[PDB]
Amino acid sequence: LAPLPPHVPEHLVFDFDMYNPSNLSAGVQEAWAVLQESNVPDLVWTRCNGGHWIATRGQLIREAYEDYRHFSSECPFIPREAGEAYDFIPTSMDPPEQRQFRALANQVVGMPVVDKLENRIQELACSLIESLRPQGQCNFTEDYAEPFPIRIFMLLAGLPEEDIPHLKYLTDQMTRPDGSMTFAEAKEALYDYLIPIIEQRRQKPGTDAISIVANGQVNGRPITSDEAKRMCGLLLVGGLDTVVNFLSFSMEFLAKSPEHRQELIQRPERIPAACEELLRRFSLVADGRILTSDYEFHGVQLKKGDQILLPQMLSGLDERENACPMHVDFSRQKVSHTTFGHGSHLCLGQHLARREIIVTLKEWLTRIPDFSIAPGAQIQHKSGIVSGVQALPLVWDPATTKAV
Ligand code: HEM
Ligand SMILES: CC1(C)[C@@H]2CC[C@@]1(C)C(=O)C2
Ligand SMILES: [C-]#N
C-alpha cells in the first residue's frame, strides 16, 4: 500500500488489488463485484499498485471513456511505470491523433478481414474439436482456448506457430505479470521480435497483417517503422490474450450449466445472443486513463496526473445497468455492457472476437453437446489487465458425441 495522496479523502479508500483481488476464489468477476456492494462508493481510491482511482459503476465508467479531454489514454495501464512505458498504437493516443492509425488497424482486423478468414476459422474450430471429441476429456485452456484464436491470429499475421510459446509468454506478462519481467521489458522483447519482420515486409510487401500495417498509410502519408512496430505490437497482444481467456470463462459456465447447454442445442440461432450475454457476464478487461488536469468528477476532486482504472468488466455487472447481473439469461432484453470498451477506443477486433466465440459455441455443442467440469476439480481464475482462467479440465462421455 502506497502513501495516501493529500487530496484523497479517507472515506473513499477501498484497497482493491487489481492483480490479486481478495475474493478471487469465488470467481474473478465476483472478486471485482465487491466494488459494487451497497456500502462501496461510486468512485474509490486504492493505495494498492502505486495508488489509483477506481470508478465502480457503469455510468462513471462510460462517462470517463467518453471524455478523452480529461481522461487520457496516454497512460492507460497500472502500475504507473507500465502506463508510462505503454506506447502501443492507437491505444496510447487520444482523438484526433488516434483516428488516423485506428483506421489502418481496422483495415487488418476489421469485419472485411473476418470475412476472408471465415473458412479457416470454421475449419480450425471443427478440426480441433473433432480431435478432442473421442478422448472424453481435455485441458480446455491448453487444448482449445489458446490454440484456436492464437493460430488464427498467427495465420493472419503470417507468423510461424513455433513462435507462439515466446509471444504468448510476453503478452501474458503485460496483462497478468508473474513478476519475472516488467511491462516495459515485455514490451521491448515483443518489439525486438517484430523489428526485423517489419523491415523485411517493407522490402517485400505481402498480404499478411504485418505487411499491411508496415506498408500502410496513415491519412495520406507513409507509416514509419516505429509506428508500425507500435501498431503491430498492440495487435499481437490483442490477438493472443482476450479471446483466449474469454473462451475459457464461457465454456466453464456452460460446463457447469446443463440448462444453458440445452437451450443452445435446441435453438442454435440463439447462439449470437448467448454470445453477447456471456460477454457481459464474463467481461474480462480493465485498463484505464490518466487525468490531463485537475478535475472534479462526481463530487470527487481528481488531480492532474492521477490514474483512474475504469473497469470495462464492471459496467455490465452493475445492477443499475442489468437486473440480476450475476445471472446469465440468453433471452435478456437489453444486454448492456462495455466489454469491448467504450468511446473512441472501442475494440477493433470485436468482430473477429464474436465470430470466434459464436463458431466455437456452435461447433463445440454440435459435436460435444454434453460435458462437465472434471470430477473434484476446482477452477482457478487470475486477475489483471485481462483476467482469465488458470486451467479448465473438462470431461464427457464419447458415446454421447457425434462427428460432423
Ligand atoms: C473477447 C475479446 C476481446 C475483448 C473483450 C476486447 C476488449 C477490448 C477493449 C476493452 C479495448 C479498449 C481498451 C481501451 O479503451 O483502452 C480493446 C481495444 C482493442 N482491441 Fe480488443 N478485445 C477483444 C478481442 C480483440 C481481438 C481478437 C483483437 C485482434 C487483434 C483486438 C484488437 C484490439 C485493438 C487493435 C484495440 C485498440 C483500439 C484503439 O485503441 O482505438 N481485440 N479491446
Ligand atoms: C486493454 C486491451 C484488451 C486493449 C487491447 C489489448 C489490451 C491488453 C491493450 O493493451 C489495449
Ligand atoms: C483487445 N484485446
Q: How far is CA 135 from CA 141, 146, 206, 218, in A?
A: 16, 19, 40, 49
Which residue spans within 42-139 are E strands per DSSP? 43-46, 52-55, 71-72, 137-139
Rounded CA separation 191/91 (Å): 16
8 Å CB contact between 254 and 373: no
Task: Tell me which of 174, 246, 308, 347 to substitute to probe ligand 1's pocket, judged by most ligand atoms within 8 Å of the beta carbon.
Answer: 347
Rounded CA separation 101/135 (Å): 45
50 burial level (CB within 10 Å; 0-12, 13-18, 19+): middle
Task: Output the CA torsion 5→8→11→12 (10° steps).
Answer: -100
Residue type, 27: G
Residue type, 269: E
8 Å CB contact between 36 and 319: yes
Grid coordinates in use for 38?
451497497
- Backbone dihedral angles phi then psi of residue 396, each to the nearest 5 degrees: -170, 165
Ligand 2 nearest-atom number relative to CA 286:
1
Breaks in the chain after (C-N > 2.5 angstroms): none
Query: What is the Cα gyration radius of the chain?
Result: 21
How, if at all, do strands 372-373 and 393-395 pair?
antiparallel
DSSP state of 47: -
Q: What separation in Å is there between the alpha carbon of 295 and the centre of ligand 2?
A: 26
Which neighbouring-strand residues pair with 395? 137, 372
**Other Cβ atoms closer than 10 A to 46:** 22
138 burial level (CB within 10 Å; 0-12, 13-18, 19+): buried
239 lines ligand 1 (CB under 6 A): yes
Q: What angle do CA 200, 205, 211 make, to 5 degrees?
A: 80
Ligand 3 nearest-atom number relative to CA 238:
2
DSSP characters for 370-404?
Answer: --EEPTT----EE-SSB-EES--EEE--GGG----
Which residue numbers are catalytic?
176, 241-242, 347-349
CB < 8 Å & 24+ apart, contacts of 103-107: 103/218, 103/219, 104/213, 104/216, 104/217, 104/218, 104/223, 104/231, 105/213, 105/231, 105/234, 105/235, 105/348, 106/348, 107/212, 107/216
- Residue among 374, 368, 377 at smallest CA distance from 400: 368
CA 189 to chain CA centroid, nearest Å: 21
- Output the residue whose Cα is nearest ligand 3's atom 2: 238
Cis preceding linkage at 79, omega within 30: yes
8 Å CB contact between 257 and 273: no
Q: What separation in Å is there between the alpha carbon of 237 and the centre of ligand 3?
A: 7
Q: Is position 347 annotated in a ligand binding site?
A: yes
8 Å CB contact between 383 and 31: yes
Q: How far is CA 279 from CA 130, 144, 238, 267, 290, in A?
A: 25, 18, 16, 19, 26
- Output the residue whose Cα is nearest ligand 3's atom 1: 238
Q: What angle do CA 307, 308, 312 make, to 5 degrees?
A: 140
Rounded CA separation 41/53 (Å): 11
How, if at all, do strands 52-55 and 307-310 pair?
parallel
Q: Experimental technique used?
A: X-ray
Rounded CA separation 161/173 (Å): 20
**Which segments of 133-241 does DSSP mark as H helices, in order?**
140, 147-157, 164-175, 183-203, 209-214, 225-240
DSSP element (H, E) containing 302: strand 300-302
- Residue among 371, 368, 147, 390 at smallest CA distance from 249: 390
Residue type, 354: R
Sorted by sequence, the CB contacts under 8 Å of residue 178 that are 6+ apart come out as: 172
Sorted by sequence, the CB contacts under 8 Å of residue 215 that are 6+ apart come out as: 201, 202, 205, 223
Q: What separation in Å is there between the alpha carbon of 208 and the centre of ligand 3?
A: 19
Domains defined along the chain, listed by start: 1-404 (1.10.630.10)
Question: Strands across the sheet with 393-395, in order?
Answer: 137-139, 393-395, 372-373
Q: What is the resolution of this structure in A?
A: 1.8
- Output the residue whose Cα is nearest ligand 2's atom 1: 287
Q: What separation in Å is there between the alpha carbon of 379 and the centre of ligand 2?
A: 25
Rounded CA separation 355/358 (Å): 5
Sorted by sequence, the CB contacts under 8 Å of residue 315 that are 6+ apart come out as: 57, 58, 61, 62, 283, 321, 336, 337, 338, 342
388 burial level (CB within 10 Å; 0-12, 13-18, 19+): buried
Give the up-direction half-sphere exposure of residue 144: CA atoms within 13 A in the CB hemisphere: 31
Sorted by sequence, the CB contacts under 8 Å of residue 122 that are 6+ apart come out as: 359, 363
